[PDB]
Design a protein around this ligand. Structure first.
Ligand SMILES: NC(=O)c1ccc[n+]([C@@H]2O[C@H](COP(=O)([O-])OP(=O)(O)OC[C@H]3O[C@@H](n4cnc5c(N)ncnc54)[C@H](O)[C@@H]3O)[C@@H](O)[C@H]2O)c1
Ligand SMILES: NC(=O)c1ccc[n+]([C@@H]2O[C@H](COP(=O)([O-])OP(=O)(O)OC[C@H]3O[C@@H](n4cnc5c(N)ncnc54)[C@H](O)[C@@H]3O)[C@@H](O)[C@H]2O)c1
Ligand SMILES: NC(=O)c1ccc[n+]([C@@H]2O[C@H](COP(=O)([O-])OP(=O)(O)OC[C@H]3O[C@@H](n4cnc5c(N)ncnc54)[C@H](O)[C@@H]3O)[C@@H](O)[C@H]2O)c1
Ligand SMILES: NC(=O)c1ccc[n+]([C@@H]2O[C@H](COP(=O)([O-])OP(=O)(O)OC[C@H]3O[C@@H](n4cnc5c(N)ncnc54)[C@H](O)[C@@H]3O)[C@@H](O)[C@H]2O)c1
Ligand SMILES: [Zn+2]
Ligand SMILES: [Zn+2]
Ligand SMILES: [Zn+2]
Ligand SMILES: [Zn+2]
Lengths: 367, 367, 367, 367
């Protein structure tokens, strides 16, 4: 069938690009509603206002309630209609960004996306994940296009807690493995077609970038400063991983992430931290070579991601919980079925326990 | 400076995808002006009308005058307002697509483009070239965004003259060398910033695809059939080179192309045919290793592109003509200035004569 | 523009060459003033006198006051005019040698240079660095030629404190990295032109020599004896590094050295010890691969050079001091601007902190 | 023994650098004798006079007799004292440069040389060959130093006959093999000591430059234009081979050259043309591996150098002539004695016949 690749229309990254926001956004619309993470507005709200004002734009700022829920979106629709804005800007982490995309779609207007962390591969995709106000999965909202514009201030990312950069590394490290599995199996992507070569190349670049640059990038995030390694890892966590997962494919790592959220123990760990264990689980399923397993385990360990179930607070009733994870992972319409030859609940259960054992031996040997 | 990559929002490629234009375009608008010339509407019109009709869309077919000019745009816009079209589809070669992009810009509506050939890398880009009704360059029209949707029917492309596929290879083969040069010089790209890693990776993938698949694809093109090699070369010629040139950078090869168009002798050659000589010229300028120049000359020769001035019909008064080419290639604003260290007219002159001598020696040996 | 390489007219190294000084110097002049480091004159003054006397030359010996200042040079001019000498010999470390060059230039006579340590790349260059008597930077004196003759007694070098050989390793280890950056950026060299191939080759040889021979050479310097590894490292620290920096180029490592001298904490560390940290800082800026960073950090550590700010006594108020270092490093006319794409004060600050972190982890891991 | 490298003080190369002779030479002297023959002053004189005039210098043009002989030197010195010149500029080919170096020596003043061809490696060296007014070898004049300044206008060199560039390649291609042999035998170099690492690295760079760039440069030479390949070959032919031979060492190839000049048949060939056969002779003597001899024969053949005795017009009485060559090459004082293990007349005789047979087989295969 057809080969399809999707992208945001334009992706921009640079130090202090928050000062140029207005100038980049001006071609899209004159009037703007900003949906902003509260923490971020706390240090940056004047800077944002000045950026728009200097470009001759009209802007109103709405603080974000914190969850991408139907209620929050509806609240923001009300504010948007009153403002009669021609476009939405999301500025924050993934929850803020998914909310802005959904809002913009319901208002039928352009959306710009300004990640203030590089924590997940949400920013670039044509998808918003909707939750209940209690923080539970509600539904996927499939958008007819990717954001018009994605603008990443690398200095703001560098000032955020380093754990959130690690989390994004854990999210993005899965990308190549999942897109390759889908290539091998011939699976349809979220873009609705088979893999392009472009998408697999970006997915592989993502993996190699993290291997070469991940540890260097963490030194910079820990000191809250911008270096070339950090710029490269931000691009990987954001553009490469975004295009790679959506237009290259999802498989076991994401299915296992979803499984793990059915366990209360891990629910407050970051998306990428759960994806990280999902990647190790996937390498058991696809029987990756010893040196590949070790390379991934070593990078994950070096940036502080979990490589064991105990690092996700899964310490008691492990067999029973892994049954739950395995069943959820193989539910109808999960992406585990994109693996070459598929995966049964028993195969995933087996992979979970064995990945945990590999993690546990890796750690012991590290003293 | 910021690092920027731009892309069409969605790129789709597949055999007989023209049957699916409706389902794919539906999410963007209900009412469409379809702009195509007589020849294309000749084979395509009834298929388009049925695909749109079955998706529940409205179409207004507007035969195209053949030239991308302000008058032609105004006329078509005339027709589009009357019909109350929400979106433009261009279907055909580069002049038709250029026109649909410009029209859609002036009317503030989305654009889809459906190339029926793969002969240049211009289609996916955020640029429209405006011409006189007589066919002379008027001005470049910079667009605020790349086409919303690009849809390539590989079966229609396979039916086009094989010469046009080779010409496309000639245009796309420059991509890597020009992006690499701009990366070495730190030049600004047409997307408005410095190179992303993503853009450089797609430019290099373009090059490697053409090396690996070029000759195989030309066998398919000459038999007018679709193979995976042809599919890959079409992607390289269209998506990879489009992103590579616009977000990776242009340099000497394109500037030499422009110089060659000041020479009446070379008027009957396609864009990519002149660019193919420009690439060899560039490799002399940057003093590429013998093995690289030989690889490029061999691929160019194997798919029928020119590697000498005589194969562009430049046979008489060659010194005098190359002074003209060199002076034009080095005109203020030209992309030759993106080469590391720049290039003077004298340097470009020298490279033109030596690239020609190199091509001549290469042809002599080949027999 | 023009490609230029500069050299001393003749470079000589050998064990006990101090005995052949007179014979080597005789073609330049009959009457000589020797400007001599006091420590050196303390053990070698009779040997020097005998060398000249045996060759039939006339010599007068002036002990060097210790700083290359305008006053010291003026004092020595007075002595030289009275002596009516036809040439100057400098014998000592870098401060003695720069003084002799400056003196010889002001008297308009030939200069010979006899390093008694291999501590910096001063000896061979067409430059004298002038200081205040208080030991502060005054001005660069650009000489119209390099020394006529450079004569290195490898046994005298071997008898000096081993720390001063390490210091020279730290000075010379920067050479390849800086000349390569300048090659990449197209920067002008101190010789006034673009890089020759000759200069880059000598710069690269310098780096590879230190990697292969640095540790072996330190064993010999510690035992105060001459081996082939020591002879090779002396040549690297003196001729290779001299030609390499002047005719290949300076970039971030030297700019960072200059920054660090604005900090009182490090002021009494040797030139090369500060350059060593500057090299690690540069490898952050140019995003060197992990294995290159590690190779350089390991060699620097093995010969006793600093790889952390604490090893230069920068232990308190580090952020504030690194702002100072970064601003000085990027001052107008510094060589940091020779890096590909340049470097802002923020980029250099970032590189300083991250290089320090890499150093600190390297040391921790070394237990 | 001491390790010594000698070099010209400053080497400058660039297109149209003749326009900058004044600014570059100013630092050495105010008043100049410019020595050039009719032909060179023919194209160069007005340019030189304007460059000097604009720098504020005085010039006295002294047309050169064509032969480097004691009479010619005395005459010119005559003119130089009258004019009260502080420095000599030689401009032209090797006989003019030789003369300027010798003159400047006898008058005790600095010398600048501006080669208008790149056909031998003699220009940069500290040696002048003196001849009879009739053109016969009189004596070698050893100079205490290399030229103060060497200035090569690559655009003038590109205008010279292509044959002279190839001849230069022939002269420079020996450099690495002769320096390597002297390094293996421990022979003393013309600079008066054992090999430095620097000199061996420049000799090997010369070889690799010619391999990589030789054929490319010959295309530029034949079109009479400047490319980077030509620039690199000019540097190899002039600076790298000059330092390589004088500070690296001469061996069999030069001795064979000398032997070949005792044979009237080879009189119409350039120095580098005879040396090219001498190199192949040397590779037989040292029993170089088949792949090395083939590489050298192929490069020599590709740029038009002789690889057989017939291509030096030695066609009759070849055994008898090769006895003469072998005896002369092995004369007391000749450099063949620097080969590891030495060489007897019989060994050299054998190598000459076998090198010829090798060349003949190589030409037969090539068609
Ligand atoms: N749509 C997709 O394709 C896709 C893909 C992956 C993940 N997601 C979604 O992404 C969400 C997770 O995003 P997230 O982990 O970024 O959560 P988030 O948006 O809640 O951000 C995490 C935390 O980071 C803080 N933060 C943000 N910027 C900061 C800054 N500059 N300095 C300091 N703190 C800062 C926020 O205040 C917040 O507390 C989930 O809802 C998940 O479903 C969507
Ligand atoms: N200087 C220039 O103007 C220049 C230079 C180089 C390339 N080009 C490009 O080349 C084009 C020139 O050709 P054109 O304008 O006449 O375009 P065109 O559309 O007429 O090109 C040939 C056509 O034949 C069609 N075709 C033939 N048999 C077919 C079959 N069996 N099934 C399906 N399709 C079939 C192809 O699909 C294609 O549309 C330009 O539009 C431009 O894109 C232009
Ligand atoms: N001109 C240039 O291109 C260039 C390049 C680099 C550095 N420099 C200059 O070099 C200077 C630093 O030179 P340095 O570090 O050699 O300083 P230095 O000349 O003061 O020598 C350092 C110490 O070594 C001692 N010493 C010298 N020879 C000895 C021996 N044989 N045995 C024992 N002790 C011996 C001296 O007495 C002195 O105390 C600075 O002024 C710097 O600006 C110039
Ligand atoms: N046995 C020998 O004497 C021997 C052997 C081998 C090589 N050589 C070398 O070759 C030389 C022989 O040639 P020559 O002495 O007649 O030297 P020459 O200077 O006349 O050589 C040719 C000249 O043509 C000039 N030229 C021609 N067209 C030009 C243009 N358009 N622009 C600029 N310059 C242009 C070149 O610059 C060059 O100076 C010797 O001087 C020596 O260096 C000598
Ligand atoms: Zn994810
Ligand atoms: Zn093009
Ligand atoms: Zn230094
Ligand atoms: Zn020679």
């Amino acid at each position: 069938m057809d080969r399809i690749i999707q992208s945001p229309g334009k992706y921009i990254q640079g130090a202090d690009v928050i000062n140029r926001l207005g100038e980049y956004l001006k071609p899209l619309a004159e009037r703007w509603l900003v949906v902003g993470d509260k923490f971020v507005l706390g240090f940056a709200q004047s800077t944002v206002e000045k950026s728009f004002k200097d470009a001759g734009l009209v802007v109103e700022i709405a603080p974000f309630g914190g969850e991408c829920s139907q209620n929050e979106i509806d609240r923001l629709r009300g504010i948007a209609e009153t403002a009669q804005c021609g476009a939405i800007l999301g500025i924050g982490g993934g929850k803020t960004l998914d909310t802005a995309k959904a809002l913009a779609h319901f208002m039928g207007v352009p959306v710009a996306i300004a990640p203030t962390i590089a924590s997940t591969d949400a920013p670039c995709s044509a998808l918003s994940v909707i939750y209940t106000d209690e923080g539970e999965f509600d539904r996927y909202l499939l958008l007819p296009n990717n954001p018009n514009m994605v603008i990443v201030d690398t200095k703001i990312v560098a000032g955020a807690p380093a754990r959130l950069l690690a989390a994004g590394i854990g999210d993005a490290l899965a990308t190549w493995f999942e897109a390759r599995a889908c290539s091998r199996s011939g699976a349809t992507t979220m873009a609705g077609g088979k893999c392009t070569q472009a998408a697999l190349a970006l997915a592989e670049l993502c993996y190699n970038t993290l291997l070469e640059e991940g540890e260097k990038a963490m030194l910079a995030a820990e000191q809250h400063v911008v270096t070339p390694a950090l710029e490269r890892v931000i691009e990987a966590n954001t553009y490469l991983s975004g295009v790679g997962f959506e237009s290259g494919g999802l498989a076991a790592a994401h299915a296992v992430h979803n499984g793990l959220t059915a366990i209360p123990d891990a629910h407050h760990y970051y998306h990428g931290e759960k994806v990280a264990f999902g990647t190790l689980t996937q390498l058991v399923l696809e029987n990756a070579p010893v040196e590949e397993i070790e390379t991934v385990a070593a990078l994950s360990h070096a940036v502080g991601l979990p490589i064991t179930l105990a690092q996700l607070d899964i310490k008691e009733d492990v067999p029973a919980k892994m049954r739950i994870v395995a069943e959820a992972a193989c539910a109808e319409g999960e992406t585990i079925h994109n693996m070459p030859g598929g995966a049964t609940p028993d195969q995933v259960y087996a992979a979970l326990l064995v990945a945990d054992q590999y993690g546990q031996r890796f750690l012991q040997e590290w003293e």
